[PDB]
Design an enzyme around this catalytic site. Structure first.
Site, PDB file in Angstrom:
ATOM      1  N   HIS A 113      -7.772  19.960  -6.779  1.00  0.00           N
ATOM      2  CA  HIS A 113      -7.898  20.157  -8.215  1.00  0.00           C
ATOM      3  C   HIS A 113      -6.724  19.530  -8.964  1.00  0.00           C
ATOM      4  CE1 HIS A 113     -11.253  23.153  -7.852  1.00  0.00           C
ATOM      5  NE2 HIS A 113     -10.770  23.163  -6.622  1.00  0.00           N
TER       6      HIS A 113
ATOM      7  N   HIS B 123     -15.723  26.659  -4.759  1.00  0.00           N
ATOM      8  CA  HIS B 123     -14.408  26.898  -5.344  1.00  0.00           C
ATOM      9  C   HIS B 123     -14.251  28.342  -5.812  1.00  0.00           C
ATOM     10  CE1 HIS B 123     -10.727  26.496  -7.491  1.00  0.00           C
ATOM     11  NE2 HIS B 123     -11.266  26.419  -8.695  1.00  0.00           N
TER      12      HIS B 123
ATOM     13  N   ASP C 150     -15.315  20.274  -9.749  1.00  0.00           N
ATOM     14  CA  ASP C 150     -15.351  21.629  -9.194  1.00  0.00           C
ATOM     15  C   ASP C 150     -16.673  21.897  -8.480  1.00  0.00           C
ATOM     16  OD1 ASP C 150     -12.757  22.548 -10.054  1.00  0.00           O
ATOM     17  OD2 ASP C 150     -13.562  22.852 -12.069  1.00  0.00           O
TER      18      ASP C 150
ATOM     19  N   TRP D  58       0.815  -1.220   0.000  1.00  0.00           N
ATOM     20  CA  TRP D  58       0.000   0.000   0.000  1.00  0.00           C
ATOM     21  C   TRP D  58       0.850   1.272   0.000  1.00  0.00           C
ATOM     22  CZ3 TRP D  58      -2.495   0.681   5.563  1.00  0.00           C
ATOM     23  CH2 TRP D  58      -1.526   0.383   6.529  1.00  0.00           C
ATOM     24  N   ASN D  59       0.226   2.388  -0.372  1.00  0.00           N
ATOM     25  CA  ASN D  59       0.929   3.662  -0.528  1.00  0.00           C
ATOM     26  C   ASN D  59       0.330   4.798   0.296  1.00  0.00           C
ATOM     27  OD1 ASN D  59       2.714   2.945  -3.131  1.00  0.00           O
ATOM     28  ND2 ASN D  59       0.625   2.213  -3.499  1.00  0.00           N
TER      29      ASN D  59
END
Ligand code: MN
Ligand code: MN
Lengths: 265, 260
Positions: free
Chosen positions: A76, A86, A82, A68-69
């Site tokens: 964004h 924003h 969006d 895993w990471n």
């Protein structure tokens, strides 16, 4: 393929359709990687982080049975969503952030506007009302509550970051809608949102128009949404596609990267 | 040619016949973070920093940067996450066939049992009894394990529930996992906890049977779900598409459920 009552249930029919292959699933999402183009603003502004990923373990001493990471990026980054919060014109709407937007809005029909041939001959090409009205003469009225997906084949530039951002001494040169087109889509067609293949829903040079970045300003100002860095729009019909676009539930998030999917029948 | 199902789906959602349920916990720095023994690599907690807020750093816009792990909050477990699924093709969140990101689900309610026993185990007999009441568990469907454990989310220590002999959270037995995979051919396993396996199953002679066998069978997992109380026993449709992280073993995601 549906039941034999006047007004049946749809989800059983839907599940069977996807299993049969009657309904296909198209991936409209770019791959999140450290090589993906990162948006850069003038030095006087705050900058978004690029996508960084670091391995925790790989079936080794750090984690013998698992892999895993950890990762870091911006709201964004890459194929993302969006939310109205924003932009300054959408700051005060109740459900304007990705954690408070009504879940119903994460699913919606879409129309696809193909302008790839035009953009191929002009990187600053502008989507106009005239062009949109001509599209309807061929494919029918743009339905209220639908995404407007702007196909430009720009996603093919993703291997070249310089080409994807396409920046010269006077800013970025990318296609986009005119103010009048944005006004028409919102006011005369009541669209759900605007989706693009570029890193910006607005035309790059629209920073200098009397009303700068009209798509961001007016869409978010009308409590609408945006999609960026989409791909495989060429595999979608002009109309009839159904979009699955649910953003991460980031607390007070102005947007988020997400897995955009299209259902096609 | 002329479509029939998708227009009905859109219409049903618009009229209110079909409801959307958010099964996702909010991503915030206060949400409980997974913790392993100090000799192992650790997942990063969710952090977030503002870039601008309609100010000098960005006059007309607001946005953030953030960092976390693939396995943070409501997230998706891919087969590549475990050593037994490392050799399957299309085993990471960027290579899994997109058709697998939408699937039906059954909801097995054990809230009453877990409320009396924190280490309660899902067994074959309970599943078979469930079927006699709600029908056979269909192949290709999620098995959503309702425990109402998500109500503990405000208290990190209570949510992880770690004592000197490990974590104490409900989960399935090895027999149950083998049965669901081998006899029902399920899509995957989804829970309200930070672990699809029972907390105490770390000490079992076959440690973490769900992770090991489910991923070993090229199947998937969902962690930290909520609002399972609003889903029917059967008939719910799950939207669960993970981020397209290159070679990703999993990711946080927005899990939705269509109900009618
Ligand atoms: Mn954006
Ligand atoms: Mn996990």
């Amino acid at each position: 393929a549906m039941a034999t009552s006047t007004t049946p249930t749809i989800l059983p029919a839907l599940a069977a359709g996807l299993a049969r292959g009657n309904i296909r699933v198209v991936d409209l999402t770019q791959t999140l990687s450290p090589s993906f183009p990162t948006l850069q603003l003038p030095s006087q502004f705050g900058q978004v982080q690029p996508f960084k990923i670091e391995r925790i373990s790989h079936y080794d001493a750090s984690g013998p049975a698992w892999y895993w990471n950890n990762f870091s990026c911006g709201e964004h980054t890459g194929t993302h969503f969006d939310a109205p919060a924003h932009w300054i014109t959408g700051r005060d709407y109740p459900g304007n952030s990705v954690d408070t937007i009504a879940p119903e809005n994460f699913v919606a029909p879409a129309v696809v506007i193909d302008a790839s041939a035009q953009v191929r001959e002009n990187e600053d090409w502008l989507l106009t009302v005239d062009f949109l009205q001509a599209w309807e003469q061929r494919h029918g009225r743009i339905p209220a509550g639908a995404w407007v997906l702007f196909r430009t084949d720009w996603s093919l530039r993703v291997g070249d970051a310089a080409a994807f951002l396409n920046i010269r001494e006077d800013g970025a040169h990318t296609p986009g809608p005119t103010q009048e087109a944005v006004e028409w889509l919102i006011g005369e067609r009541n669209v759900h949102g605007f989706g693009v293949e570029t890193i910006n829903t607005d035309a790059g040079q629209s920073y200098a128009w009397p009303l700068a970045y009209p798509c961001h300003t007016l869409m978010h100002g009308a409590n609408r949404y945006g999609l960026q860095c989409l791909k495989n729009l060429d595999q979608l019909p002009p109309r009839g596609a159904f979009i699955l676009a649910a953003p991460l539930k980031i607390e007070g998030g102005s947007g988020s990267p997400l897995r955009v999917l299209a259902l096609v029948e």
